[PDB]
Amino acid sequence: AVALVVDNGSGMVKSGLAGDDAPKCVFPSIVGRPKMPNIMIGMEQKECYVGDEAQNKRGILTLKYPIEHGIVTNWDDMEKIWHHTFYNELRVSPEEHPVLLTEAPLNPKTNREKMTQIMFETFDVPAMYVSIQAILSLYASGRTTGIVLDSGDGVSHTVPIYEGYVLPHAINRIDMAGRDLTYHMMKLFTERGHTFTTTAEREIVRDIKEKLCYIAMDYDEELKRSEEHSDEIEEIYELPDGNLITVGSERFRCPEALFNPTLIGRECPGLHITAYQSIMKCDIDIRKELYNNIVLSGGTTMYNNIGERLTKEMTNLAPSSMKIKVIAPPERKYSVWIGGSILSSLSTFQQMWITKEEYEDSGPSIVHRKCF
Amino acid sequence: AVALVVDNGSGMVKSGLAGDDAPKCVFPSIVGRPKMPNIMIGMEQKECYVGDEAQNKRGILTLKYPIEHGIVTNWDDMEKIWHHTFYNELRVSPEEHPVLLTEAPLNPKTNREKMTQIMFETFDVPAMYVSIQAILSLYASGRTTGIVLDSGDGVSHTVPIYEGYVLPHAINRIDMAGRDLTYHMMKLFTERGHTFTTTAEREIVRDIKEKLCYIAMDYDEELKRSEEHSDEIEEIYELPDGNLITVGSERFRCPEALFNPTLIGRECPGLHITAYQSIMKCDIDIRKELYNNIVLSGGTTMYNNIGERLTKEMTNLAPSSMKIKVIAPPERKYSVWIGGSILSSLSTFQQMWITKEEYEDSGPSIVHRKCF
Amino acid sequence: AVALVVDNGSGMVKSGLAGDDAPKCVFPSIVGRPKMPNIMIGMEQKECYVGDEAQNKRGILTLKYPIEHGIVTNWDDMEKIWHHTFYNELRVSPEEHPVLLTEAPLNPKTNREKMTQIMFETFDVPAMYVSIQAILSLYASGRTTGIVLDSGDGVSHTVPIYEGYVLPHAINRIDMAGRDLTYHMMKLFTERGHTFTTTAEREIVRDIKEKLCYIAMDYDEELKRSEEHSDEIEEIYELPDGNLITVGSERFRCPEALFNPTLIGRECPGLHITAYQSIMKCDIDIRKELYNNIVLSGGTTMYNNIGERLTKEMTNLAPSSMKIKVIAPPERKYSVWIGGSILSSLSTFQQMWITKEEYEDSGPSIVHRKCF
Ligand SMILES: Nc1ncnc2c1ncn2[C@@H]1O[C@H](COP(=O)(O)OP(=O)(O)O)[C@@H](O)[C@H]1O
Ligand SMILES: Nc1ncnc2c1ncn2[C@@H]1O[C@H](COP(=O)(O)OP(=O)(O)O)[C@@H](O)[C@H]1O
Ligand SMILES: Nc1ncnc2c1ncn2[C@@H]1O[C@H](COP(=O)(O)OP(=O)(O)O)[C@@H](O)[C@H]1O
Ligand SMILES: [Mg+2]
Ligand SMILES: [Mg+2]
Ligand SMILES: [Mg+2]
């Protein structure tokens, strides 16, 4: 039977059938609830909107995210999202297809235990398997050795792998991703005169950041040019209500927080520093191959001139006799799903599944012995 | 049982059976009392005239309005008007038909409480329901999203609704309607030589205003043309006593007070300004749909070239990327009654009624929990 | 030379000499313009009234506020207000005294730039300095560590400070203050039968709110008692025209919007929630001292039983091993001015000034490098 690949994250959720080269259903993971009285008798209303319907009618809805920092806070909303994905988006019965789920490294055991319990006791799936996102990201690139720098919506992590062997003592994870960048962008916009506070305004700011941001090679030079050639940097954006907003110096000052987290008041190191620290925790003979297979993945790495900036930063830290090559292939925003689809279509993988009998006999703890 | 739709307002009262496409009995809400001695023995006189009879014999009667600014002042006259409507106009027993009444937004609770008490303890109606006029006006147009600008005889209000959800924090109401326009018309007529003071003269001036008024697209240009091409604007009107009156520049100077209330010494803003302020109090993503569904209702909006003037005024305020469409359908003077008839004929509405038992047990305050 | 302390806000403006323990001139910041024709030849009239004169003759004047949400909208009115303060109230020459101005956090740069330009190019002040209001509020209390919850007329903000170091990433600001409470009070009064629309009526409602409002410890219990013991809550107030108004349940329902902004249709969180969120954004070891130094400031915090309510609300959120102490000293409505006077009288502060030469050489942008 064809397996279901469901990559659930903080911001977006991707779902599809194992065997394709692109996800089938990509939708935001939000739950909307009405806050205004209903007075028009005759129409059929709903108590909760999930997915695109919640985003379209966000004007009269309060929006909640059931996943924060890769950890599920409310399980009812997550169960509703899973039900919507299975019964509305994919329109496939969740009882004849094995499930392949993804999880971030260094997560509490209770999250996996509850996820497995919900999958086996609510949807009654035949089999399921949970895998780390970095492994699937490395699978999607068709390589066996490299360091994966993944940056999603809530969690950014770094995982090195050498010749199919992972080094768990050199795995890094920090909670600083596109959401903090959106908050920083809102704070920067408050200095221009525009104030955004509501959830709909937050989505508008997120869209503005996605459409009109880039990474400057030299931050100081562009900052100097911002006060002298602002006409080149200014960009006009049309708000949904018809007003116009001028985005100027905020185009590159917002993504700069990745390489200097002190702007947003975070003591954690930057991205290049984290990668260098992760490389230096491995053996001496392993570092040479890791320096040449830096793979980028995640939606937060979809900016412009990011690979060149990362290469320049790594050059000033790595020894002058090494070769640094950053791998930023196109369509890398769906690399995890592609890797999961590739993994699920292998004959050797057809044995590493958690069947119903094993879960019923051993219990929910079996996920700590067969899934890694 | 067929329900009774009774829209009672300041100037006129409409009444009919739920299921028709037009009101059955439309008559002015006035109470007439004699002021001259009666010396002709042999005829059967009456102590009070209500409705058309009071208007026909207004020469020897003093006329009183029991409703002012949507608030009932004297309840005896209102009870007499209700009795006349039930027993003379409709000729139906008010004990086998549910009643559907209308009320203006932002009204005192005591008005609703006394109305419900009178309906349940005097006419002994089986069930009753009170609804806002804007909701019925939006029902009559067959829409679910829009901003309703209602202007009756004493009260003009603005209510936005988005996808069946009303925003109570963006509801406006001002006490400036056709009565102030009639007073302004009388004041303008005093400058020509004609003086009107009595109630009958007030009704004559109201008829003149109804028959010979229009809204000028450019007030300044027509004002300039008034002193140079008066022959085009002059109109002859025949008074009931046979005299002739020339209405000239007063044709467009009287309705102009809607867009500039400073003419009649009122500090409240105009109509377009009020609509724009009501639109700007909603969320950013809601404004686009509200700008495209401006619905006009009420008897005061039955002038000529009013939709074009409103569109031109809104264009200069709304952003240059929005589409403004004013909806002024024909027969809009009875839109509230049509909406009430449509609402009362729905199966889903057959449950939202205040039965006799509920009123007797809970008390008169129940109207504050089941009627909105 | 003695410095001038001028705290200009939305509602009121305070001005005095640095060295005193109380402001010298406290007057509303309104600009009045006549709207009626003048027919009495022989009297000397004025084209605009500013301050108490505008408030006394508000019957025949239209009143405008030149400051909205801590942002100056019209600069001509603000310049007139500054001229009135310097030349009429204080009666001191604005050329031999340094100026100390106050500003709210998270404000546009253009506001400060224009303020400095006006101060240096119109009044020709020798030196000036702009400071945040929270810093002065903390100075006035004689402390070094604490969280300041300031609530004025248009803007309410929260600023934590630990041992003289401010945490900019934990500063909150929302636009919800006494003006929205006045609007809510007017809306509540419309349900009793009284309608207030004009600016003079708005000032009357503001006075009623100032004189007859208090905060209920248990909102539900007092709401239940409102429908059973209204005689205890009813209060008689005398309108300027001689009529009497009964204020009953509206005494505590108006200030309740601070702890539940959903009543006035605002999605922003309440006051205790905002304070708790601001405390949780600091480091773990800093929270203990912040929980014990909650300082209240502003005119909107001059209600009754507000400290006890805030303490009770914070107790249910803070851990059961912390000590919560709300600091609400008397005369806290002028805390900002007292703090500014204390700061301006220090010898160490005699160097942090913007002289004429520095402004002339560097330009208006210098205020972004020496004032914080
Ligand atoms: N073209 C783009 N440019 C800049 N940022 C982007 C772009 N596309 C997406 N993003 C950011 O990436 C985030 C999406 O992260 P995603 O990888 O979907 O998280 P998850 O791994 O939980 O699904 C969004 O919050 C958005 O801000
Ligand atoms: N054709 C017309 N042209 C101009 N004004 C009109 C016209 N018809 C009615 N009016 C005005 O509308 C008013 C009637 O208001 P109406 O909607 O009946 O009030 P209510 O909602 O209380 O019944 C009258 O006072 C009259 O001046
Ligand atoms: N005793 C009081 N009780 C309740 N509210 C008050 C009292 N005194 C003042 N206020 C409110 O505080 C507001 C004054 O705010 P203020 O601190 O003067 O603003 P700013 O900081 O801009 O000068 C007024 O709008 C008033 O409604
Ligand atoms: Mg991801
Ligand atoms: Mg009407
Ligand atoms: Mg203040």
Six-digit token pair at C258?
């601070």
> Structure resolution in Å?
3.5
**Would the CB of B213 count as within 6 Å of ligand 2?**
yes
**CA-based torsion, B1, B7, B8, B11: positive or negative:** negative
Six-digit token pair at A217?
């090679």
Six-digit token pair at C82?
């500054």
- Checking DSSP bridges between strand A354-355 and strand A127-132, what pairing results, if any? antiparallel
What's the CA angle centered on A157, arms A155 and A162, to 5 degrees? 155
Give the residue among B343, B319, C214, B225 at the shortest CA–CA distance from A242.
B319
Six-digit token pair at B365?
């305050």
The ligand 1 atom at the shortest distance from the C-alpha of residue A179 is: 25
3-state secondary structure chain C: CCCEEEEECCCEEEEEEECECCCCEEEECCEEEECCCCCCCCCCCCCCEECHHHHHCHHHEEEECCEECCEECCHHHHHHHHHHHHHHHCCCCCCCCCEEEEECCCCCHHHHHHHHHHHHHCCCCCEEEEEEHHHHHHHHCCCCCEEEEEECCCCEEEEEEECCEECHHHCEEECCCHHHHHHHHHHHHHCCCCCCCCHHHHHHHHHHHHHCCCCCCCHHHHHHHHCCCHHHHCEEEECCCCCEEEECCHHHHCHHHHCCHHHHCCCCCCHHHHHHHHHHCCCCCCHHHHCCCEEEECHHHCCCCHHHHHHHHHHCCCCCCCCCCEECCCCHHHHHHHHHHHHHCCHHHHHCCEEHHHHHHHCHHHHHHHCC
Give the residue among A202, A149, A151 at the shortest CA–CA distance from A176.
A151
**Minimum Cα–Cα distance from A59: chain C residue:** C267
Half-sphere exposure of A313 (CA within 13 A, CB side): 23
| Chain A: closest CA distance from residue B252 (Å) | 34
Q: How far is CA B362 from CA B109, B115, B125, in A?
A: 16, 16, 17
Helices (H), A176-270: 178-190, 199-211, 219-226, 230-233, 250-253
CA pair distance C34, C162, nearest whole angstrom: 50
Q: How far is CA A313 from CA A218, A252, A259, B191, C341, in A?
A: 11, 17, 9, 85, 50
CA pair distance B114, B117, nearest whole angstrom: 5
* Contact (CB<8Å) C195/B174: no
* Contact (CB<8Å) C110/A195: no
Contact B153, B299 (CB under 8 A): yes
CA pair distance C218, B104, nearest whole angstrom: 33
Please tell me the distance between residue C336's alpha carbon and the centre of ligand 6 in angstroms. 7
Pocket residues: Cβ below 6 A from ligand 3: C 9-12, 152-153, 178, 206, 209-210, 213, 298-300, 302-303
CA pair distance C271, C149, nearest whole angstrom: 8
- Checking DSSP bridges between strand C156-162 and strand C165-166, what pairing results, if any? antiparallel
Give the residue among C79, C87, C88, C70 at the shortest CA–CA distance from C31.
C79
Helix (H, G, I), strand (E, B) or coil at A148: strand
DSSP β-bridge partners for residue C172: C158
| Chain C: closest CA distance from residue B91 (Å) | 35
Six-digit token pair at C348?
């160490």
CA pair distance B326, A2, nearest whole angstrom: 54
DSSP string, B184-229: HHHHHHHTTT----SHHHHHHHHHHHHHS----SSHHHHHHHHTT-
**CA-based torsion, B226, B227, B233, B234: positive or negative:** positive
Decide: residue A142, CB within 10 A, 0-12 exposed, 13-18 middle, 19+ buried.
exposed
Q: Whose CA is nearest to atom 2 of ligand 2?
A: B210
Instruction: Give the number of other CB atoms < 10 A from CB of residue A146.
Output: 21
Q: Whose CA is nearest to atom 9 of ligand 3?
A: C299
DSSP A85: I
**Would the CB of B335 count as within 6 Å of ligand 2?**
no
Amino acid at position C137, single letter: S
Which partners does chain C have (≥3 C-beta pairs < 8 Å)?
A, B
Residues of the binding site of B: 10-12, 14, 153-155, 209, 299
Which residue do the tokens 């996808």 mark? B163
**Would the CB of B9 count as within 6 Å of ligand 2?**
yes
| Chain B: closest CA distance from residue C192 (Å) | 6
Contact A77, A83 (CB under 8 A): no
What's the CA angle centered on B261, arms C69 and B231, to 5 degrees? 145
Residues of the binding site of A: 10-12, 14, 153-155, 209, 299
> Residue B61, Cα to own-chain centre: how many angstroms?
24
Contact C67, C31 (CB under 8 A): no
Contact B68, B41 (CB under 8 A): no
CA pair distance A15, C116, nearest whole angstrom: 57
Decide: residue C215, CB within 10 A, 0-12 exposed, 13-18 middle, 19+ buried.
buried
**Would the CB of B302 count as within 6 Å of ligand 2?**
yes
CA pair distance C363, C366, nearest whole angstrom: 6
Sheet harboring A127-132: ordered strands across? A25-28, A12-17, A4-8, A99-103, A127-132, A354-355
DSSP β-bridge partners for residue B149: B158, B296
Method: cryo-EM
Give the residue among C160, C136, C153 at the shortest CA–CA distance from C278.
C160
Q: Whose CA is nearest to atom 27 of ligand 3?
A: C178
* Contact (CB<8Å) B346/A42: yes
CA pair distance B202, B118, nearest whole angstrom: 31
Across the interface, of B109, B168, B169, the residue whose CB is closest to C191 is B109
Contact C49, C61 (CB under 8 A): yes
Amino acid at position B101, single letter: L
Six-digit token pair at B50?
């209500």
* Contact (CB<8Å) A41/B343: yes
CA pair distance C231, C238, nearest whole angstrom: 18
Please tell me the distance between residue B302's alpha carbon and the centre of ligand 2 in angstroms. 7
Chain C positions in Cβ-Cβ contact with residue B284 (cut-off 8 Å): none
Chain B positions in Cβ-Cβ contact with residue A42 (cut-off 8 Å): 346, 348-349
The ligand 3 atom at the shortest distance from the C-alpha of residue C67 is: 22
Please tell me the distance between residue A16's alpha carbon and the centre of ligand 1 in angstroms. 19
Contact B352, A41 (CB under 8 A): yes
Chain A positions in Cβ-Cβ contact with residue C167 (cut-off 8 Å): 265
CA pair distance B3, B372, nearest whole angstrom: 19
Give the residue among B91, B97, B84 at the shortest CA–CA distance from B128.
B97
CA pair distance C339, C142, nearest whole angstrom: 9
DSSP β-bridge partners for residue B269: none
Six-digit token pair at A364?
């929910």
* Contact (CB<8Å) A57/B168: no
- Checking DSSP bridges between strand A25-28 and strand C146-151, what pairing results, if any? unpaired
Residues 6+ apart with CB under 8 A from C135: C159, C161, C166, C339, C343
Please tell me the distance between residue B153's alpha carbon and the centre of ligand 2 in angstroms. 6
| Chain C: closest CA distance from residue B262 (Å) | 10
Find the length of chain B.
372
CA pair distance C102, C8, nearest whole angstrom: 7
Decide: residue A114, CB within 10 A, 0-12 exposed, 13-18 middle, 19+ buried.
middle
Residues of the binding site of A for ATP: 10-12, 14, 153-155, 209, 299
